[PDB]
Amino acid sequence: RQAQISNITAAKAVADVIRTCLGPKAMLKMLLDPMGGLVLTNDGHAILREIDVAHPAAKSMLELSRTQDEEVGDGTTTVIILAGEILAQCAPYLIEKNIHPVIIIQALKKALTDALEVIKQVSKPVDVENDAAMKKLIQASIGTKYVIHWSEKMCELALDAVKTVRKDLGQTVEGEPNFEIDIKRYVRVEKIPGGDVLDSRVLKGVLLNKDVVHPKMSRHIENPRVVLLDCPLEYKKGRILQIEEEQVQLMCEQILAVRPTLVITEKGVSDLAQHYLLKGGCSVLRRVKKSDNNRIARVTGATIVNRVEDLKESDVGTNCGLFKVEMIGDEYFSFLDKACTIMLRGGSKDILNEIDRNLQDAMAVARNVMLSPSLSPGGGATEMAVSVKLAEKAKQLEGIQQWPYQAVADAMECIPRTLIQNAGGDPIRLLSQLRAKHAQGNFTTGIDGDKGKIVDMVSYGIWEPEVIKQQSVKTAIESACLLLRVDDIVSGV
Amino acid sequence: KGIDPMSLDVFAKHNILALRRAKRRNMERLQLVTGGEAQNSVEDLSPQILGFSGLVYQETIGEEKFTYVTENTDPKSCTILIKGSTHYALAQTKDAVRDGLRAVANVLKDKNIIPGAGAFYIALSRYLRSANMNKLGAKGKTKTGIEAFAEALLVIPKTLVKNSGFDPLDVLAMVEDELDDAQDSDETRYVGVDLNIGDSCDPTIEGIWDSYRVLRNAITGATGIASNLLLCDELLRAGR
Amino acid sequence: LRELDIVHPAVKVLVMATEQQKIDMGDGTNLVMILAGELLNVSEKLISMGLSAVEIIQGYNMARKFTLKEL
Amino acid sequence: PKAESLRRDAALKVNVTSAEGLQSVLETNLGPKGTLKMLVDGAGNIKLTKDGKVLLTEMQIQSPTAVLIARAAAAQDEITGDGTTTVVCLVGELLRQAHRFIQEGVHPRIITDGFEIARKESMKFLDEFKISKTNLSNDREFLLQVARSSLLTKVDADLTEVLTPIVTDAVLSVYDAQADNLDLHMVEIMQMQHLSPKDTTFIKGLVLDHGGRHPDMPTRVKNAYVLILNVSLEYEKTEVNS
């Protein structure tokens, strides 16, 4: 039983620090570094990352926060408090009451299913095609930030970025894709220095920063022909200049058989091959990455070919609008316009770095709406509404599975409790009236963060997507069953 | 560059002052002060390149000798020479010059000025106290923060008289009694604390003024920093 | 004072003031040390009485101008 | 049954106590009637100044509470340039007045929220209380009294009358006509030893350090010609080896 206590002690001591980090009114934290520095930021991600821990239970919460941030952009402290309170509420049952841990784990599996059903009942429908409705959603990650002034332009960049990746289809044959969108590879932003944020547009295609091998080239091509290749064009290896100039010309003549208007070489391009393809009316781009060829083949359609003599006749330049050598910001660009490219602009490098983390968290809220047209009330409304429904279902729950079940109902009230403690109101008086409010009034009545008195969400909606509530409850049960599964501690190799 | 001693005797008959071993940074400063361009070659020297200067007199000191390029038509560059016997005399005066030139420059750039000697702190502390009861548009619990902020500004006039040895409570009653009589008289009268005499004073007649940009960010800056100290929930120490 | 290493800050004031007497004149090395040393001794009665050291400095400035004018 | 009892408030009282000892030391130099602090690095260096930022950069702060106070005064000198100690006095003293409310159970958020409301109301009173000064150059007489605010603070006031015409005439000389800007870098600050502090005088132009040494050099010249030459007038050598 000594290791079971350490799992509770190590998990609570780390989670207790970030209990005050939840909400817009969250209090600041001070972390003194051994080198003499301090951390003034209240973000739970930057605090616990710099805190060195010993017991492995704290390291499990660090990897859980990194995985949770890849799904949702906000609500990092919500998952830690919810997953840490369930273990804290099971402390008297597992230790004092001598309840077997598998009985608790078995009860958390059935409580996870009922928890997801209550969220779907209190959820409200939302139109994903309405551009005006999506502005009030992303606004949760907009306000109290530098992007509040450009929010009108920021929402246009966030919505138009996921429209290219998303695919809307359904049927009973191939199933439902559930609107799978990849923000990482396709929606990856590209920060270009200079320009203006108002001029930032969503570019559909791929972008490359490498310049053109020749200074003077055609600024636009009517029908661009894209040809992809692997092996570079150079004199091969087993009076001399006559053979070297002829060998390169023969390798370039095979490409000119179809007379392409553009030449793309994966490896470097020698100076001998640049003069032969210059008079042919085609641009040559040296040093093209291999990972880009997969994305370039989608915006173009050129088949990947290794040897220069293996080029297939099926290669065409279709599905390419224009080719622009135009220079923006003293840097030569290339415009080849399921995958778009986000072009970010600003007045300095510090502006681009701030928009980066802000736009990623802005699109994470819009992405969660695409997984399903449902929203949940914030400010502790959904957290308390579930706890009220958990106590009503206990009438059929008689048997040993009922005792660990009560630890979940008290854990759902911990999220609104931390907001009241940071608000300054009486936590006993407000939580008692809030729990009785759901038993009579509607489930949509939450708690205001600025005031701290029970109010209806009709005034200020603060509508969070269901994915935030889903992943918070799902990962909390998995984290609770993770520490309860390990009853022993053994060190050494 | 250097000058041989053989030419010093020829230059002395014509009463020409010769200099050598000059800093490269001070050479470019003379182009702005005097206006004459630097002559790279004597064969290209022209009479229009030379400039004009005022009275030039060389002070006689055994340790060093100074040359004054001063008294120019449009020099547009000043110089402040700090004199002192010891090390601390030069360092203490240097800080007063750096802070003295910037305080005057802020008056020319920023057309707004504020009186000192606690004129702004006493007037703002009394105004916010009586205005909170007439407005009542914030909250009942907010009165604690407003009353604490008004009493926090009174430490400045109490500190100025604390080092002088005067009673901070006696000088406070004389200021509050004057503001009550000047309010009902329907006029504008500025009140300030006189450190030498100990009674009140008029900051416009006494000539005590502060810059507007200094006190604008002083109240706003100290508010956010002092608030963040109360926002600290727990003090963590790692590696010790 | 040159052969001895001066450390304490209140002592450095009299030592740096002694070097000020070395320049511009060759006399008064013992005058500046005894006079400035006694001014601090007579000021002890003002400190224990409760008088702040700020007005004590201002009192010597008014007496210095009256002394130099009478010389 | 684990524990949940108090937020314990103790880490907050330590932060307030650390600010009380910091203000109590720094409040002695406030105003012209204040005291002059001395710093010793152990090697014999002495720097006498009442400025807040200059002192804090020479000392190390172990407590993390006073670190934010010293870093706050650094941004004040880069913007305001004056009253760095006054800002520090407002941070620590405000915690003492709020300490009475903390022991009574008042939540610190309402204490901080009430400060932002009073700060916005102070900006409205600041616009009515401020007085606009004309850009006209006839204010030189009025600028003499304004310049004494910074001068009388850092000195015993015996040297203020000497430095009063120097500081006033230095700013208005480089000031461009028709309400233009000025350059503080154009005013040079130099120092020298073996002189009395009362002999400090104003320098209109540029002064040179190393002078010419010769008994027959002219003592004073009413008007002279200025020449800047890069050619060496001393003995030179042949460009080629000989």
How many helices (H) and strands (E) in chain B? Answer: 9, 9
Which strands, in side-by-side order, build the sheet including A38-39? A38-39, A30-32, B235-237
Residue A129, judged by CB atoms within 10 A of its CB (0-12, 13-18, 19+), counts as exposed
Question: Chain B partners of D181 at a C-beta cutoff of 8 Å?
Answer: 109
Residues sharing a CB contact under 8 Å with residue C59, sequence separation 6 or more, in sequence order:
none
Helix or strand run (H / E) with residue B151: helix B142-152
In chain D, the DSSP E strands lie at 38-40, 46-48, 131-132, 188-192, 202-203, 207-208, 220-221, 225-226
Q: Give, in order, the Cα–Cα distances in Å from D219 to each of B37, B53, B58.
A: 26, 16, 6
Name the D residues in 43-102 with CB < 8 Å from any B CB: 46-51, 54, 64-65, 68-69, 72, 75-76, 79-83, 86-95, 97-98, 101
Whether residue A266 contacts residue A288, with contact meaning beta carbons closer than 8 Å, is answered with yes
Whether residue D211 contacts residue B62, with contact meaning beta carbons closer than 8 Å, is answered with no
Question: Chain B partners of C20 at a C-beta cutoff of 8 Å?
Answer: 85-86
Residues A3 and A47 in one domain: yes
Between vectors from CA D22 to CA D19 and to CA D27, what angle results, nearest 5°? Answer: 120
Closest chain B residue by Cα to residue D102: B230
Q: Looking at chain A, how many residues does it have?
A: 493
**Domain range for D193:** 134-204
In angstroms, rounded to a whole number, what is the distance separating the alpha carbons of residues B90 and A484? 71
A266: tokens are: 């994966």
Residues A263 and A283 in one domain: yes
DSSP string, A329-354: SSSB--B-----EEEE--SSHHHHHH
First to last CA, chain C: 30
Whether residue A446 contacts residue A23, with contact meaning beta carbons closer than 8 Å, is answered with no
CA–CA min distance B236, chain A (Å): 5
What sign does the CA torsion over A154, A158, A161, A163 have? negative
**Domain range for A385:** 1-126+374-493
Residues A108 and A142 in one domain: no
CA–CA min distance B165, chain C (Å): 6
CATH label of the domain that carries residue D176: 3.30.260.10
Of A103, B159, A142, A234, nearest in space to D86 by CA: B159
Residues A318 and A356 in one domain: no
Three-state DSSP class for residue A17: coil
Residues A198 and A343 in one domain: yes
Residues sharing a CB contact under 8 Å with residue D64, sequence separation 6 or more, in sequence order:
A30, A32, A38, B235
Active-site residue numbers of A?
Answer: 43, 76-77, 361
The verdict on a CB contact (< 8 Å) between D158 and C61 is yes
DSSP string, B65-97: --EE----SS----EEEEE-SSHHHHHHHHHHH
Residues sharing a CB contact under 8 Å with residue D130, sequence separation 6 or more, in sequence order:
B112, B113, B114, B212
CA–CA min distance D223, chain A (Å): 52
The identity of residue B87, as a single letter, is H
Whose tokens are 């083949």? That residue is A297
The verdict on a CB contact (< 8 Å) between B65 and D211 is yes
Residues A147 and A221 in one domain: no
Point out which residues pair with A38 in neighbouring strands.
Answer: A32
Of A469, A479, A406, A393, nearest in space to A89 by CA: A406
The verdict on a CB contact (< 8 Å) between B88 and C16 is yes
For the CA atoms of chain C, what is the radius of gyration?
14
Residue B210, judged by CB atoms within 10 A of its CB (0-12, 13-18, 19+), counts as buried
Helix ranges (H only) for A123-214 are 131-138, 151-165
Resolution for this model in angstroms, one decimal place? 4.7
Q: Looking at chain B, how many residues does it have?
A: 240
Question: Chain B partners of A27 at a C-beta cutoff of 8 Å?
Answer: 231-233
Q: What are phi and psi of D229, to 5 degrees?
A: -125, 135
In chain B, the DSSP E strands lie at 51-52, 56-57, 67-68, 79-83, 112-115, 192-193, 200-201, 209-211, 235-237
Residues A90 and A131 in one domain: no
Residues A191 and A96 in one domain: no
D221: tokens are: 């010249």
B166: tokens are: 């005067």
Q: Give, in order, the Cα–Cα distances in Å from A290 to each of A120, A188, A241, A267, A302.
A: 45, 17, 31, 9, 14
Residues A186 and A332 in one domain: no
Residues sharing a CB contact under 8 Å with residue A296, sequence separation 6 or more, in sequence order:
A206, A226, A228, A264, A288, A302, A336
Question: Chain A partners of B235 at a C-beta cutoff of 8 Å?
Answer: 30, 32
How far is C-alpha D4 from the geometric centre of its chain's CA atoms?
A: 49
Whether D contacts B, i.e. 3 or more CB pairs less than 8 A apart, is: yes
Strands D225-226 and B51-52: antiparallel
Residues A173 and A296 in one domain: no
CA count, 13 A, side-chain hemisphere, A360:
19
Helix axis angle, A151-165 to A349-370, nearest 10°: 60
Question: Chain B partners of C23 at a C-beta cutoff of 8 Å?
Answer: 85
Residues A44 and A147 in one domain: no
Indicate the residue of C20, C52, C55 with minimum beta-carbon distance to B86: C20
Mutate to test the interface with C, among D29, D30, D33, D41 (most CBs of C within 10 A): D33
Query: Widest CA span of chain C, in angstroms?
Result: 40
For the CA atoms of chain B, what is the radius of gyration?
29
D25 CB within 8 Å of a chain C CB: no
Residues A280 and A301 in one domain: yes
Give the count of domains, chain A: 3
In angstroms, rounded to a whole number, what is the distance separating the alpha carbons of residues A35 and B151? 38
In angstroms, rounded to a whole number, what is the distance separating the alpha carbons of residues D95 and D100? 9
Mutate to test the interface with D, among C54, C60, C66, C68 (most CBs of D within 10 A): C54
Three-state DSSP class for residue A437: helix
DSSP string, A104-144: HHHHHHHHHHHHHHHHHHH-EE--SS-HHHHHHHHGGGTSS
CATH label of the domain that carries residue A191: 3.30.260.10
Q: Determination technique for this PDB entry?
A: cryo-EM
The verdict on a CB contact (< 8 Å) between C9 and D38 is yes
